[PDB]
Amino acid sequence: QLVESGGGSVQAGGSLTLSCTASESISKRIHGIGWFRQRRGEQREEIAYITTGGRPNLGDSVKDRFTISRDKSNGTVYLQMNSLKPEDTAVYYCHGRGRWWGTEGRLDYWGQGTQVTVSS
Amino acid sequence: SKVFTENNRYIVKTLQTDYSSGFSNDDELNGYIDMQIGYGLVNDHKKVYIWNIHSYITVPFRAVAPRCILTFPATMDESPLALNPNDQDETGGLIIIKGSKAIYYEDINSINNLNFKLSEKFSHELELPINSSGGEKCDLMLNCEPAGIVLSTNMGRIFFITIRNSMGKPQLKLGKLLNNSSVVSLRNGPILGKGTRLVYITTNKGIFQTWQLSATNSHPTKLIDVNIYEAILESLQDLYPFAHGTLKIWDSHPLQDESSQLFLSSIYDSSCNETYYILSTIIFDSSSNSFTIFSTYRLNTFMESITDTKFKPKIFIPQEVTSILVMFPNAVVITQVNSRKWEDIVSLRNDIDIIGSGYDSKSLYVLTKQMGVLQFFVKE
């Protein structure tokens, strides 16, 4: 299982930290951990990713505001969301980029998804 | 008999055979070597020339050049009878794909130097559904006995052909169609018992299939049917974004453990006109029809484009350390890995032409038009 934590409601300019905790077996079947944002009536979109080796990557819409890091002591991956905006309001999914591939394509892992709401 | 180089990585030497560079007045020669049958073959536009690898037979078939493959002699495994005197002279057979007509000679001994009119009466023939009008032609051929023979065409069609019935008697039957697009690799897998073996098929689109083929009244089954193209592209795109639109799959080869394959691909960087050859090791899970890329290596000693549209580079993997040989038009690159990577190259002179290859458990054999057979033995 992928497990995600840290969602909630803040005001514009506030800050939240999401976390993603992966089991041993899943961590073996993925290249990295990422986060997808889904505003409502929109599709999911990847906004942050960090390889197992700690190489971080941020989408253009968040890269000056959010930070993605890993704690190597437990492998937990953190998305620290600073400088929040009303348009950051969305469900956020943590995501494991799979190493295995099937008939339907790459076999990825998803968290259950957590709500972030930013009011102005 | 003549060693040209021996170092602690490899030996390159000649293999004295009955091949002769004066079989034909024709520069263009098709051919290959079957070390397991013990014979080599070249053909031009008129005749196929069959020669022993241990120190020949001319079969006129008359245009573009046909595609020819050798077959094993009629074996009778585990008979209670004393062997015949005369059964120790059968040498094996010959299949010629002329256009849409497959021609099978069970025994080449009886057709030596016979004009085609009359030798054709010794053959079994099979009309294959090949669109010669539209430009379709035979491309690759694999001898996958005891199951039979697999043909591909330049337009992606794959025929499984049987050459015995259920009782060892020679025939020529289209067993099954196994289906711009084109097959890049036909490879033998393990024998599974009486008349049955696996065959691996790779297309240039990245489709990889494992087929269970049988001469024994069974009908073909796919055990694996996956597409590896995007996975390989993803393994490359971060360091080599020019892989997008240039990734090309050239060959594949099974590994030891029967569940993994090695694939040979290339990508091209137009900024500096470098072609980069990629070795991708892929593990397949038969249960779930899925795979993963275990490892990716780029060749460092050979970055040339293959501009001969006919030449197809070919992998050889001897049957710890894993050795991967890749034969290019005028070089053989040797890669070794702990079963750190390291890489050697054997560069050939540019005025010799490779016209086919063969292999045994330890060595790659390269048929050159001008100098005969060269053996590349990698030390393990």
Residue numbers in the entry:
A (entry chain K): 3 to 122
B (entry chain A): 58 to 112, 119 to 125, 133 to 249, 264 to 403, 412 to 431, 441 to 481
The authors write:
In Saccharomyces cerevisiae, the heptameric 575 kDa Y complex comprises Nup84, Nup85, Nup120, Nup133, Nup145C, Sec13, and Seh112. Here we report the structures of the Nup84-Nup133 C-terminal α-helical domain and Nup133 N-terminal β-propeller from S. cerevisiae. The structures were obtained using nanobodies, single domain antibodies derived from alpacas, as crystallization chaperones.
Nup133NTD is a β-propeller consisting of seven β-sheets (blades) that are radially arranged around a solvent-accessible core. Blade β7 is the exception, forming a 5-stranded blade made up of both, the N and C terminus, of the protein. This Velcro closure is common in many β-propeller domains and is thought to stabilize the closed fold. All three β-propellers have seven blades with two significant elaborations, an α-helical hairpin between blades 4 and 5 (α2–3) and a 20-residue, mostly disordered loop between strand 3D and strand 4 A (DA34 loop). Additionally, this structure has an elongated loop between stands A and B in blade β1 that is ordered due to crystal packing contacts. Despite the difference in packing between the two structures, the six copies of Nup133NTD in the VHH-SAN5 bound structure are highly similar both to each other (RMSD 0.17–0.22 Å) and to the VHH-SAN4 bound structure (RMSD 0.68–0.81 Å). The majority of the differences come in conformations of multiple, extended loops that are generally more ordered in VHH-SAN4 bound Nup133NTD, presumably because of better crystal packing.
